[PDB]
Design a protein around this nucleic acid. Structure first.
Ligand code: K
Ligand code: K
Ligand code: K
Ligand code: K
Ligand code: K
Ligand code: K
Ligand code: MG
Ligand code: MG
Ligand code: MG
Ligand code: MG
Ligand code: MG
Ligand code: MG
Ligand code: MG
Ligand code: MG
Ligand code: MG
Ligand code: MG
Ligand code: MG
Ligand code: MG
Ligand code: MG
Ligand code: MG
Ligand code: MG
Ligand code: MG
Ligand code: MG
Ligand code: MG
Ligand code: MG
Ligand code: MG
Ligand code: MG
Ligand code: MG
Ligand code: MG
Ligand code: MG
Ligand code: MG
Ligand code: MG
Ligand code: MG
Ligand code: MG
Lengths: 149, 46, 77, 271
RNA sequence: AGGACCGAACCGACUAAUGUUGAAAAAUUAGCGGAUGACUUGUGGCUGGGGGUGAAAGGCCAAUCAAACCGGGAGAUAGCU
RNA sequence: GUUUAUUAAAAACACAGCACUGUGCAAACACGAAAGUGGACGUAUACGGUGUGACGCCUGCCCGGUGCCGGAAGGUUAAUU
RNA sequence: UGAGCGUUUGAUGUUCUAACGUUGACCCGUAAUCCGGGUUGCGGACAGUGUCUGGUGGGUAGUUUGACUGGGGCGGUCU
């Protein structure tokens, strides 16, 4: 089916593209998020009415993501305590929720879906690197320390 | 010996009585057939 | 029941015909699936039991025109 | 414990009872009791959907803590108790805050002993810990299948599973069936094996004991007529058919599992 | 203690006789078996006909059962009487 | 103990015990177009199906046939195309 | 890793989540082990269902299973 991309979506196209896509991809991902619109002629003219100013909202969203990423890289170190026994082996875990609540406690707020933990869910104490993304193009790093309760 | 009809009025009314006939569509057709035939006694209810 | 909420496809009845042409009664059921459709207008997911043909006409006509047709028919959701 | 009755009557000749003198001879704990009525093996359509069930002694249901989710609070075992709903015995335990619960009683548990639950409890029998924190090779029971859903595996008397491997988010269990099955590591299990392991060694001795247990007689299909069962019929004892259920599926080797949704969790089927 | 023993109520029904247009469409009389149990019984409730239920006799399902009864297709068909 | 209410109570049925087989739990299985319910608020020392039938001593040889289980490299083979 | 023409269609093997499943947990409607919505975890394009299709299928159903004959069956016969 034919859709119009309102944003850069991976390896499909830029802002505005007569692109042929799979129907499940349009129906379950691209249209329920703000990423694509079906390509009926009313929707094509309705997009082309404000296509010249559609780049401004994407630019300010990218600028807000860059400002949040600099904030995160200015913060750079977060501390969470948890119940660990002999050595460092945490009895529980410090997961997304705990990490997201820790950055909201440390500085300005971050959401639950921004963390991109590559190794795991932080089962051991010590120093860890936690990745963040607010946009599809931006990426940030946080040093996270887990200590005893 | 013990014959087949062992009378209980409460079981009679719960099995064949008027509200048991109205509780289902088929008992309502039973009542409709008896009314169309012109039965002086619609159910077992006294 | 087994009714598509968009197209109104119901189970219909036919015959299972054998090689010796023995007919036995059978049903043709619609290809029905419960599905959550995102409405861009009202910021919501509506769950509809739709046929796959109903999902095709939902993709063709939009979910708003289809939901207007169900609202005109008095179909709730 | 295992006691052979003296043959003072033909129904008592072969009876083997198990006796447990540490079980509580008094009444069960009333706030943990609940009515459960008999079904006769009959569903809500009133039809017999499971044969040979009916009668027997009326039983009260004991609410047994299969979740074991009171973390960090120690409990002391008040008493061991008979449970008519299960082959295992139960334990009335009293926590430190004052709430009483019923747990499945493991083998190495007596009155006065201490149990704990949660991620930081010690590795002793009766302690319930997520299987991430249980070391590999340990013998556990009351095993959760989903995390937080409460114990489903190894609840019968004498039973246990072995945690034979731990890889990633899943541990591998050897069940009492002999099969190896993956269960995720956030699931909880209670250390030790279930007690009352002499429950297999009881001999009912007579038909009446099974009728007290609520099992109605099983009639062989070859004793019936052909209208009642595929095995029915014959002048004298005749069989000449492949052995089947009363609905016609072969009952001497034909496998009946068809899940496909849980097939990823079985690493090896039983032998 | 006991699907333990003897034996009434209670439940059953092995033998014989009578009765066979009966006192009775299955009983009477004399004996007989179980008689704390897989017992028996009252009052309610549930399971519906290719279905139920069956310690299994094709048993029972209202004096009817190798497919209940009632009404309908129906004046089925009958190379038979 | 049970059974052919009403010509058969038995050596028949059941039975405790035994064995085979199924079944990892949303279990197998069953009633049900389905929802669901029983199995079971049970979890393989559990539940279903089958045969055998306390207990004692035992249960030999045959996988050619028919079934069941496992394999899948070849041969053959449906809709589709 | 194959076929046309880097591209496009397959065949497999991983990874993901967003359809779908959840008889996981929690919150709300709500005094509610039904249901629905939400949050979250797990599974995940699998499972499951519709149509078509091959197998299997006395579990169930409708039926057939000849005639002659010194009765019938068995034997024999049928042009
Ligand atoms: K037979
Ligand atoms: K019938
Ligand atoms: K007898
Ligand atoms: K053989
Ligand atoms: K063979
Ligand atoms: K068949
Ligand atoms: Mg059984
Ligand atoms: Mg018990
Ligand atoms: Mg048996
Ligand atoms: Mg038997
Ligand atoms: Mg017989
Ligand atoms: Mg048969
Ligand atoms: Mg013979
Ligand atoms: Mg023979
Ligand atoms: Mg006695
Ligand atoms: Mg006596
Ligand atoms: Mg009396
Ligand atoms: Mg007498
Ligand atoms: Mg005697
Ligand atoms: Mg017979
Ligand atoms: Mg009768
Ligand atoms: Mg008939
Ligand atoms: Mg006619
Ligand atoms: Mg006539
Ligand atoms: Mg006897
Ligand atoms: Mg008789
Ligand atoms: Mg007799
Ligand atoms: Mg269930
Ligand atoms: Mg026998
Ligand atoms: Mg042999
Ligand atoms: Mg094979
Ligand atoms: Mg037939
Ligand atoms: Mg006909
Ligand atoms: Mg002839």
């Amino acid at each position: 089916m034919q859709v119009i991309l309102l944003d850069k979506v991976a390896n499909l196209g830029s802002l505005g593209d007569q692109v042929n896509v799979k129907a499940g991809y349009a129906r379950n991902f691209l249209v329920p998020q703000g990423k694509a619109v079906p390509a009926t002629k009313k929707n094509i003219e309705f997009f082309e009415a404000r296509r010249a100013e559609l780049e401004a909202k994407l630019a300010e969203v990218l600028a807000a993501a860059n400002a949040r990423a600099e904030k995160i890289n200015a913060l750079e170190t977060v501390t969470i305590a948890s119940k660990a026994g002999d050595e460092g082996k945490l009895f529980g875990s410090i997961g997304t929720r705990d990490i997201a609540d820790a950055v909201t406690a440390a500085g300005v707020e971050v959401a639950k879906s921004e963390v991109r933990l590559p190794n795991g869910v932080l089962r051991t104490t010590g120093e860890h690197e936690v990745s963040f993304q607010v946009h599809s193009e931006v990426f940030a790093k946080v040093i996270v320390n887990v200590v005893a309760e | 010996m013990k014959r087949t009809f062992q009378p209980s009025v409460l079981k009679r009314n719960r099995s064949h009585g008027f509200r048991a006939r109205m509780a289902t569509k088929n008992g309502r057709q039973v009542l409709a057939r008896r009314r169309a035939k012109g039965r002086a006694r619609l159910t077992v209810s006294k | 029941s087994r009714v598509c909420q968009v197209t109104g496809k119901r189970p219909v009845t036919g015959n299972n015909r054998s090689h010796a042409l023995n007919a036995t009664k059978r049903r043709f059921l619609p290809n029905l699936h419960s599905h959550r459709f995102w409405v861009e207008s009202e910021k919501r997911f509506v769950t509809l039991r739709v046929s796959a043909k109903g999902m095709r006409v939902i993709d063709k006509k939009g979910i708003d025109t289809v939901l207007a047709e169900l609202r005109a028919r008095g179909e709730k959701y | 414990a295992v006691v052979k009755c003296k043959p003072t009557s033909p129904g008592r000749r072969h009876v083997v009872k198990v006796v447990n003198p540490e079980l509580h001879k008094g009444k069960p704990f009333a706030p943990l009791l609940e009515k459960n009525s008999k079904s006769g093996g009959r569903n809500n359509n009133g039809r017999i959907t499971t044969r040979h069930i009916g009668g027997g002694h009326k039983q009260a249901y004991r609410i047994v803590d299969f979740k074991r989710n009171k973390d960090g609070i120690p409990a002391v075992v008040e008493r061991l108790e008979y449970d008519p709903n299960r082959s295992a015995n139960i334990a009335l335990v009293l926590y430190k805050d004052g709430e009483r619960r019923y747990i499945l009683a493991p083998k190495g548990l007596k009155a006065g002993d201490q149990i704990q639950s949660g991620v930081d409890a010690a590795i002793k029998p009766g302690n319930t810990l997520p299987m991430r924190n249980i070391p590999v090779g340990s013998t556990v029971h009351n095993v959760e299948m989903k995390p937080g859903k409460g114990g489903q595996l190894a609840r019968s008397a004498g039973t246990y599973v072995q945690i034979v491997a731990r890889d990633g988010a899943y541990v591998t269990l050897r069940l009492r069936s002999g099969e190896m099955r993956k269960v995720e590591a956030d699931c909880r299990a209670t250390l030790g094996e279930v007690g009352n392991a002499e429950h297999m060694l009881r001999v009912l001795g007579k038909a009446g004991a099974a009728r007290w247990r609520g099992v109605r007689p099983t009639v062989r299909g070859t004793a019936m007529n052909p209208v009642d069962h595929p095995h029915g019929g014959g002048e004298g004892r005749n069989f000449g058919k492949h052995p089947v259920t009363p609905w016609g599926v072969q009952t001497k080797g034909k496998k009946t599992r068809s899940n496909k949704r849980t097939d990823k969790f079985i690493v090896r089927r039983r032998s």
